């Protein structure tokens, strides 16, 4: 319990003081030079945020991690999907989740995500 968050978890913001804690952790490690973990943590709280610029910053931090940590790349595709989805970029979200789905046809979390993305795409076009 449990490998990824739910899309629902993605829509529950942290309390401001929780987000600030995650920010101060990255500050304490030098910002750009912070650990992958501490940066992911802050990025995930930013993705959860109802502020569009926070969400963009979270996605940006996640693409950094994707670029720099090959071992983390499959894992980051899941977050990049949710990020783009919250941002209205469903074409990008479909792309990411398709890659990820090619590596896990049997994972129920991914198929749940994939389904949401394609339901949204369906609904919006139309």
């Amino acid at each position: 319990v449990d490998f990824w968050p739910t899309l629902k978890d993605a829509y529950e913001p942290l309390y401001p003081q929780q987000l600030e804690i995650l920010r101060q952790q990255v500050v304490s490690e030098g910002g750009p030079t912070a650990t992958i973990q501490s940066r992911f943590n802050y990025a995930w709280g930013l993705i959860k945020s109802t502020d569009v610029n926070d969400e963009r910053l979270g996605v940006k931090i996640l693409t950094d991690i994707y670029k720099e940590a090959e071992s983390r790349r499959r894992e980051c595709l899941y977050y990049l999907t949710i990020g783009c989805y919250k941002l209205g970029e469903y074409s990008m979200a479909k792309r990411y989740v398709d890659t990820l789905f090619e590596h896990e046809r049997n994972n129920k979390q991914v198929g749940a995500l994939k389904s949401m993305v394609e339901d949204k795409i369906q609904k919006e076009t139309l």
């Binding site: 973990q37 992911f40 995930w44 983390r72």
Partner: peptide
């Protein structure tokens, strides 16, 4: 390897414990 999300779920309860 233990997930990023798993590391995140560990971090915040402990950080909040540290607050005074």
């Amino acid at each position: 390897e233990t997930s990023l999300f798993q590391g995140f779920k560990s971090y915040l309860p402990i950080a909040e414990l540290a607050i005074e």
